[PDB]
Design a protein around this ligand. Sequence first.
Ligand code: CLA
Ligand code: CLA
Ligand code: CLA
Ligand code: CLA
Ligand code: CLA
Ligand code: SF4
Lengths: 208, 77, 740, 41, 209, 83
Amino acid sequence: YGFDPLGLLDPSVSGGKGEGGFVNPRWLQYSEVIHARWAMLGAAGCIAPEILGKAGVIPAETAVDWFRTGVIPPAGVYKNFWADPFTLFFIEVVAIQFAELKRLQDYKNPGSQSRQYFLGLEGLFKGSDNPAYPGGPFFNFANFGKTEEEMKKLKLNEIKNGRLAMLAMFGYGAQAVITGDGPFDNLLAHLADPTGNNLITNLGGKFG
Amino acid sequence: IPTFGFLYVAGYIGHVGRQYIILSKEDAKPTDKEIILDVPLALKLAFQGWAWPLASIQELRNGSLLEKDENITVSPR
Amino acid sequence: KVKIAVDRNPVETNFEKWAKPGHFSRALAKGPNTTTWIWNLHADAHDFDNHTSDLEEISRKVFSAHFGQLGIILIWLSGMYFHGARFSNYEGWLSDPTHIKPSAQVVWPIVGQEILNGDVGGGFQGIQITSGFFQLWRASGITSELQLYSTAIGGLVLAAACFFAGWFHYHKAAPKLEWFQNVESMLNHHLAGLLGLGSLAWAGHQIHVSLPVNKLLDAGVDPKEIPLPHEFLLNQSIIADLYPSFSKGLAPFFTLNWAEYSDFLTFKGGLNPVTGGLWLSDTAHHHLAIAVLFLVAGHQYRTNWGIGHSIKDILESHKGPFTGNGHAGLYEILTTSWHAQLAINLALFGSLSIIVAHHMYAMPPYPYLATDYGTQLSLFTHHMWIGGFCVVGAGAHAAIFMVRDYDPTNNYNNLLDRVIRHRDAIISHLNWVSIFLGFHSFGLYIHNDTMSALGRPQDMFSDTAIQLQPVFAQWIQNTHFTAPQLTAPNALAATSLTWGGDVVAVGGKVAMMPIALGTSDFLVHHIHAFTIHVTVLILLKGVLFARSSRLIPDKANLGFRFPCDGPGRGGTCQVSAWDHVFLGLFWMYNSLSIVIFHFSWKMQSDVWGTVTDSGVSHITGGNFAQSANTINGWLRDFLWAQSSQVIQSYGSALSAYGLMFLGAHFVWAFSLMFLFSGRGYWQELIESIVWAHNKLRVAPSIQPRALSITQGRAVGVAHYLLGGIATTWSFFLARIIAVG
Amino acid sequence: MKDFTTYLSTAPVVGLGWAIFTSGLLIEINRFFPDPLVFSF
Amino acid sequence: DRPLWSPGSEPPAWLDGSLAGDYGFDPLHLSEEPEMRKWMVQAELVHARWAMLGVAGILFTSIAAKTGAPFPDWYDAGKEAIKTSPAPLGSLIFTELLLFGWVETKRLYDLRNPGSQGDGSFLGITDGLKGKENGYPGGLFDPMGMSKNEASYKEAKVKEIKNGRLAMLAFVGFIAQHHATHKSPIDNLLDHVADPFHVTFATNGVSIP
Amino acid sequence: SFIGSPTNLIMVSSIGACLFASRFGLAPSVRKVAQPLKLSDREVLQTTGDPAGFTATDVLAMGAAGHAIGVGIVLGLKGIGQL
Ligand code: CLA
Ligand code: CLA
Ligand code: CLA
Ligand code: CLA
Ligand code: CLA
Ligand code: SF4
C-alpha cells in the first residue's frame, strides 16, 4: 500500500553477500505474514470463549478471560486442566520447536524438508518459491487458491485481515491491562455507554 | 634437602627450555616457534626432563653444552 | 535521506587470523625478529588508524569494540549482583544497616586468609566492601537474594546478547560509512531514546517499585513481610494506602492536575532523617523531569522529515567578527575523525564524572550511604580518578586527532586555525597564570611553614593570624541556604546540607552537617586551581604543538607517538604530544591526590563523626582549621595522624590493606627505574645477558631487546600511577574502615 | 579445529595453562597439607 | 544422501558418513583432524560402552529392588556396599586403577599403532588383542563372532552407537531426575505410567520454581 | 480535561492555533524550512488530502508543540494564581 515512512524495504539495505541480516524484504514479508497469521489465531482465541460464554454455547466455568487462562498466573491460572500449565508448556516447546525449526530449515534451503524422511510427510513439506506461501497437499489441502487472480485476491485479503488482527491483539492487550476484563466486556461497555466507557474515562479509573 | 629440592626443579626448567631452544633453532624461520609454541614436543621434553642433571653433565662432557667463543657475539670494547 | 546502510558478510568468521597474532599491521605481519614485536603487537592492537585507511572498516571495528566493552561491563555487573546474591550479608544488612558493615566478597580459607574474613556482623564473615552496592540495592527496591540472582542472570544474558551483537554487527551485517555519518539521527536517538527513555523507565520503576519498598523500609517494617513490588504494580489498593494519589489512578496526569501527585513526586530539600539519603519521591520527580527534558531535546535535529535543525547550518551560522570564520569546518571534522569525537566525549565524560563525585559526596542519593563513610569516600575518590584519567585521555586523543586527522585544506580561517595561529600567546599566558597560581598558592604554604618554624604564629596566613577568608564561597553558601526562602519558595529545605544549618544523624553517626570554609579551605582550593591550570597547560601545549613547533617544524611527519628527534637543538627528548600526555598523567595524579586528601581530611575533621548529647564530636578533633595551613601540619596531622591503623592492621581483618599498601609502595618505587633511566644502558646489559645465554647455547631465536623509549616511559608512568593509586586506596580504605 | 588449535598453542598455552596448572597444584598442596617449615617427610 | 541431525542442513566435510551413526552433527568442528577424529571415535565408543554397562546395571538393581530383593538405590550403592564388601575402600580403587591402567594403556597403544598388541608380547596372543577397526577390536573380544559378515557388522555398529548415545542420555536423565525426585528410576517410571497427566518433570517441586 | 473546563479550553485553543498557524506559513513546518525569519517554502513527501504541506509528520510535530505549549500555559497559570 506504500505505507513505509521510516523505510525498511529498500533493496540497498543489507546489500552484498551471505545470508545477511533481518532487515530485508524477504524476511520482512515472511515475518509480516507470520505475525499476521499468529495475530489472527490469537484474536480468534482471545474472544472466542467470551462470546460463547455469554451465549452459553460452551460451559461458562471454562469461559474465562484470555489473560487468566494460565498465560499470566499473576492475572489468573485455570486449575481445571488435564495437565499443569508447565507440562503443557513443555509439550508446546517440543511441538512448536519442531514446527518452527522445520520452517527455518526450509527458509534457509527451499524444498529441503521434502528430502529428509519425516513420517512419510515429505510430500506435504515441499513448499513453493515463496517460503511464506508453502502450499501443497496439506498447507493448501483444499486447492481453493488455484488461479493467480483469485490467489492474489486471497493474498490481499489475508494480509489485510492480518493487519487488522495486529491492531486487534494490540487492543486486546491494552484493554486487558487498562481494565482487567475481557475484550467483549469492553465492547459491551462501549456499546451501553460510549462516553462513560471509553479511553478517556478508563485511563482515570482503577487498574489504569 | 629443600635446597636440592628447588635445584632439581630449577635445572628441570632450564634443561627443558634449552632442549626446546635447540630443537626449535634447527627449524625453518625459527623465530615463530617462540610466539607459536608447539605442545606435543614441549610436553615430550617436559616429561623427559626428570634426568636433567645426567643430561647436563653428559652435554658438558661432550662439549655440546657450551659453544666456541669464535661463534659468540663479542663486544668490540 | 537517513537510512540503514549495511553491508552483509564483509569478514568471514574463522580462526585464520587467530593463528597469526600479528595480522592487523603489515609491519607486524612478517614475524617477531626482535622482542619489541610483542610490545608493538599489544600496543598497536586497537590502533585502527594505521591498520587501514578506510573509515568504514574503522567505524565497524570501533562499533564492535564498544559492543565488546558493553558485554564486559554487563558481565562485571552481573558478577557483582551474583556476589550480592550468594556471598553477602545483604539480608542481614537490610534489617540493620547502622550496625552491620556491608560485605560482598568472601575469601577462601586456603592460606591465612581466614583473618581477612572479618566480623562484619549479622552472623557473617567476609571482606567489608566499599562500593556502596548495598545502599544502591536498598534504593532500588530489593529485598531477597533471589531478586539479585535474577538480576545477575539477566545481566549475563544481556552480556551474551551484546557480544553476539558485536559479532553480528561486524562479521555478519556491518553498517556502511553513511550509517555512522548520520550524526543527527544518532543524536536524536541517544537523546530522546537512550537517556530520555532510561530516565523515564527509572522514574517509573522508582514510582511503582522503589517508593513503596523504601516507604515501608524506613517505617520499621521488616523486609520479610514487605510486599513484593509486583503486588504494588498490579494492585492499586496496596499502593493507594501508602500514596493516596494512586487512588485517582492516572486521572490527574491527563487532566493537568499534577499538584495532586505531591505525595510521591515531592519537591523536598535535604535528606531523609531516617536513612540519611535523598527522598525517593524527589528522585522520582527528578528522573521524570529529566526524561521529559531529554525527550523534548531529542526532537531537535533534522533527520528525514524536513523539520528539525541542521548541525552544519547551526555551526556555519554562528560567525562573530573577532573569530573570522566561525565553526565553518567543524562539522566535517567531527563527521570524519573518530579521534576528535573521542576527545570531546572523553573530556565531557571525565568532567561529568567529576560532577558525579562532587554531587554524591554533597547530596547522598542512597539510603544509609552518608553514615557509611567508607562507601562515600571510596565513591568520591574512584569517580575523581576516573574523571581525571578520562580528561587526560581526552587531551591525548585530541593530540592524536591533531597529528593524524587534521587537514589544513578544509580549514583556513576557522576557529581551529586561529587557535593554532595564536598558540604561543595561549601557552605563554597559561604559563604565566600557572606560575602566579603556584607562587600565590604554595609560597603561602611555605611561608606559613616558615613562620611556624620561626615561632611566629601571628604572621601566618591562618584564621587566628591575618586571613584570606573565602568570601565568595561563603556568600554562595549563604545564598543557597536562603534560596528556598525567596528564589525557590516551593522547596521544603536547602538542596544540600553543605550550606545548611541542621545536622542530620542516623545511628548516632553524622550523616551530613554544614561545612565551614576558612583560610585553609581557600589555600587548598587555590592549590587545586593551580594544579589543574598546570595540567591543562601541559595537555594543551601537547595538543597545540603536536602538528608543528618553532623547534621542530616537521613534527607532523614524525607521527603522534615518537620518542624524540635526536639530541639535536640541545636535545629534543619528550617533544612528542604523547610525552606531553605522559607528563600530564603525573600532574593529574598530583592534582587528584591533593584533592582527595583535602576531601578525606575535611570530612573527617568537620563533617564525619559521632553525634553526642553534649555537642557533636568529629572523627578528628577539628584539626583541619588549625593544621591545614602548613605543609608540615598537613603531613603530621593527615598522613601521620592517620595511617596508624594501616601499619597496625596486621593480625586483623584489614591486614590485606597493609599488604596492598606496601606492595603499592613497591610498585610506585619500581617505576622510577623506567623513568630516570634510558634505553642504551639497558640494551647493553641485555647484550651482556645475551652473551651469557650464548655461551651455553640457550640463546632465544627472538632477539632480546630493551624496551623502547616511548615503551619505557609508558611502563614507568603506568607503574607509577598504579603504585600511587593503590597506596592512596589502601591508606584511605584502612583508615576509614578501622575508624569510621 | 586446526585453525583454533593453532591459536590455542600461542600465548595462553604458556601464559594460562602453565599458570593455572602450577597455581592450582600449589593451592592444593597448601590446602590438603598444612603450612610446613621443616622437611621432615 | 543420508539422514542428518537437522533436515536440510549441510553435513561437515570431515563427516562423510563412513563412521557409525554419522548424522553430521558437529557445530563445534571437533574431530576435524584425522588423528583427533580417531581419538574422538575411540572416546565416543568407550564412553558409550561404559554408559550402556552402567545404565544396564542401574536398571537391573532398580528392578530387583522393585521386586523385593534387598538392592540399594542407584545412588549411594557403594556407600552401603563397602560395609559388606570384603575388599576395603582404597585397595579396591587402586586394584581397579592398576588393572585399568594395564588394559587402557594396551588399547591406547593399539589405537596409536594398529595391531601393535597382536605381536604375541602378552601371553603369546597374535590374532587376538589385535584391532580390527578404529575403536573396534577383535579376536578374544569377539567370541561368538557375528562381526565377520560386513553388512551385519555395519548394522551392529550402527545399533551399538545408537543404543550407546541413548545410554548417555539415559545416564544424564538418571542423575537429573534422581536429583529432582530422590527416587529410583523404576520408581519414576512407575509414577509416570500411573499418573501421566499430573506426575511429570514440572510437578516435582524442584527444578521448576 | 473535562469538557468546558478552562484547561481543556486552553489546550484546545493552543493545539488549534499551532495547527492553524502552520497551515498558512506562520510556522517552520515541513514545507517551510526556517531561517532566522523562516522562508523559502520547500516541498517533500505528500499532504494526503487537504492542500499545503501538512502530512502525518506535520500534524504530529504541531500537535506535540501545541500540547507542550498548552501544558506550560496551564501549569504556569496554576502557579501564578489563576486556573
Ligand atoms: C515507563 C514507565 C512506566 C510504566 C511501565 C508504568 C506502568 C504502569 N503504571 Mg505508571 N506511572 C509512570 C510511569 C510508568 N508506569 C509515571 C512516570 C507516572 C507519573 C507519576 C505514573 C503514574 C501512575 C499512576 C498514578 C498509576 C499508574 C499505574 C500503572 C499501571 C497501569 C498501566 C496503565 O495505566 O497503562 C496501561 C495501558 C495501556 C494502553 C498499555 C498497553 C500495554 C499492553 C501490555 C500492550 C500489550 C499488547 C500485546 C503485544 C498483545 C498481547 C500479547 C499477548 C500474546 C500476551 C502500569 C503497571 C496505575 C496502577 O498502579 O494500576 C495498577 C495507577 O494508578 N502509573
Ligand atoms: C629456560 C630458558 C632459560 C635458560 C636456560 C636461562 C639461563 C640463564 N639465564 Mg636467562 N632468562 C630467560 C630464560 C632462560 N635463561 C628468560 C625467558 C628471561 C627473560 C625474563 C631471562 C633473563 C635473564 C637475565 C636478566 C639474566 C639471566 C641469566 C641467566 C643465567 C643464570 C641462571 C638463571 O637462573 O638465571 C635467572 C633466570 C631468570 C630470572 C629468568 C627466569 C624466566 C623463566 C624461568 C624462563 C622461562 C622459560 C621457559 C620455561 C622455557 C620454555 C620451556 C619449553 C618446554 C617450552 C643462565 C645462563 C643471568 C645471567 O646472565 O647469568 C649468567 C641474568 O642476569 N637470564
Ligand atoms: C533509541 C535508539 C537507540 C538507543 C537506545 C541506543 C543506545 C546505545 N547506542 Mg546507539 N545508535 C542509534 C540508536 C540508539 N542507540 C542510531 C539510530 C544510530 C545510528 C545513527 C546509533 C549509532 C550508535 C553508535 C555508532 C554507537 C552507539 C552506541 C550505543 C550505546 C552507548 C553506550 C551507553 O550509553 O551505554 C548504555 C548501555 C546500555 C543501556 C546497555 C544495554 C544495551 C542494549 C542491549 C542496547 C539496546 C538498544 C538498541 C537500540 C535496541 C534495538 C536493537 C535491536 C536491533 C535488538 C547505547 C547502548 C555505541 C555502541 O556501540 O554501543 C552499543 C556506539 O559506539 N550508537
Ligand atoms: C573512551 C575510551 C578510550 C578509547 C576508545 C581509546 C582508544 C584509543 N586510544 Mg586512548 N586513552 C584513554 C581512553 C580511550 N582510548 C584514556 C582514558 C587515556 C589516558 C590513560 C588514554 C591514553 C592514550 C594514549 C597515551 C594513547 C592512546 C591510544 C589509543 C588507541 C589504541 C589504544 C590501544 O591499542 O591500547 C592497547 C591496550 C593496552 C596497552 C592495554 C592497557 C593496559 C595498561 C597499559 C595497563 C592497565 C593496568 C590496569 C589498569 C590494572 C592492571 C594491574 C596489573 C597488575 C594486572 C585508540 C585509538 C594510543 C594511540 O596510538 O592512539 C592512536 C596512544 O598512544 N590513548
Ligand atoms: C613537588 C614537586 C615539584 C615541584 C615543586 C615542581 C616545580 C615546578 N615544576 Mg614540575 N614536575 C615535577 C615535580 C615538581 N615540580 C615532576 C616529578 C614532574 C614530572 C611529571 C613535573 C613536570 C612538570 C611539567 C610538565 C611542568 C612543570 C612545571 C613546574 C613549575 C611550576 C611553577 C609553579 O606554578 O610553581 C611555583 C613554583 C614553585 C612551587 C617552586 C618553589 C617555590 C617556593 C615556594 C619558594 C618561592 C621562591 C623563593 C622564596 C625564592 C628563594 C630565593 C633563594 C634562591 C635565595 C616549577 C618550576 C611547569 C612549568 O614550567 O611552569 C608552569 C610545567 O609545565 N613540572
Ligand atoms: S636521551 Fe633519548 S629521548 Fe632524549 S634526545 Fe637522546 S635518544 Fe632522544
